[PDB]
């Protein structure tokens, strides 16, 4: 510590890490970058890959949202109890990222023309997570093992934004539906999800959701 | 162990993990899935995300090429020496993956019309790695720290396929070009790169490179 998130004024690729920090009782500073500031081209060339988020943990500076999540998972004990679980958590998180990338492409480049196709294909992309839950204590714990991990926070965020895109998309995924309800009721997450800083933040930068 | 790689008959997303295994003196089985077999639709529904590679390590079955890389990195001691290095290796590997995804899209969907633009944009995407090398012992060690890591095997593979796609792409990146030469000279890597199994395997599945 201390922690600083440097990002556009959206939920996007930072809401999962924010929920993680909140659920761990951690404070952090937000440095909000506006689009007009970004277009001036001062900050962008100083970012490793030209993009946000940028994240500071003490004198450690990171880019890449999933590297930040993994770092928080490693440093706060949210990465499983052994190597087998850590590998499975990575396999989950990579699957979350694959679907998130498709979501972002829909939202930002093809919303009107692509949404129907996307929603029709969505059950096939959610089923793997239902299956994973079914095989871990019949789905009554977390996505891997019996302790929450960085992958849970990312998966939870992914599921929540998809419930906005496609209400009832979890109607046929009972384990995922109960998992979302359960994690959402964790007191520090419930408080985060009703906090003004989260509620007033749009999901994406173009207002579509 | 023992290790099995289940994958299409290409280098693709498995040549980095193959190099890693070869360099660490490990043996593995290749279960090659032809296009004809894959299109029979028997194996695909049993894969977690409907895709390959699939990886078996004793009784652990994994998917997701980067999760497999991280699992081999964790279990074989190729993940740095502290939390700081591990986070930086993740930030590197996520950048490698971002470019790999763009490479795959070019190869399989848009080679003829997209190649000129892709090659024009390539230096901008390789520069971050030259910069990281320039800040870690003037490029004479590895991408993070002074021990080879899973991120090195992935970055090496990314650079090698880009040298075939765009000869001379490292001409203005002397650290990256020296790094490719040095790591390719590691005796077990050089032997793997000379082996008929690798030499006869096409980079991609569509005859383009
Ligand atoms: N692989 C990276 C991907 C990061 C990424 O896509 N960053 C986008 C922001 S998230 C998506 C996004 C885009 C725009 C806004 N906005 O408010 O205008 C918000 C969010 C970015 O920096 N874009 C600016 C650029 O490339 O110059 C990661 O996981 O962190
Ligand atoms: N995020 C995943 C991405 C895996 C992926 O793209 N898998 C591709 C194979 S790699 C690219 C590829 C495509 C085709 C061949 N080929 O020889 O026919 C080889 C490699 C796949 O399974 N495609 C089949 C499908 O989706 O049904 C990862 O990192 O492992
Ligand atoms: Ca985003
Ligand atoms: Ca789309
Ligand atoms: Ca591939
Ligand atoms: Ca499976
Ligand atoms: Cl819970
Ligand atoms: Na905001
Ligand atoms: Na997002
Ligand atoms: Na997020
Ligand atoms: Na990632
Ligand atoms: Na996925
Ligand atoms: Na080592
Ligand atoms: Na990404
Ligand atoms: Na593909
Ligand atoms: Na392209
Ligand atoms: Na360009
Ligand atoms: Na070494």
Residue numbers in the entry:
A (entry chain A), B (entry chain B): 1 to 209
Paste lines from the article.
GSTs function as dimers consisting of two similar or different subunits, each with an average sequence length of 200–250 amino acids. Each subunit of GSTs has at least two binding sites, the G-site and the H-site, which are able to bind GSH and the electrophilic substrate, respectively.
X-ray crystallography was used to determine the crystal structure of MmGSTP1-1 at 1.28 Å resolution as a complex with S-(p-nitrobenzyl)glutathione (Nb-GSH). MmGSTP1-1 was crystallized with two molecules in the asymmetric unit. A molecule of Nb-GSH was found bound in the active site of each molecule of the dimer. Notably, Tyr108 makes a π-π aromatic–aromatic interaction with the nitrobenzyl group of the bound Nb-GSH. Each of them is located in the vicinity of the H-site and forms 24 van der Waals interactions in total with protein atoms.
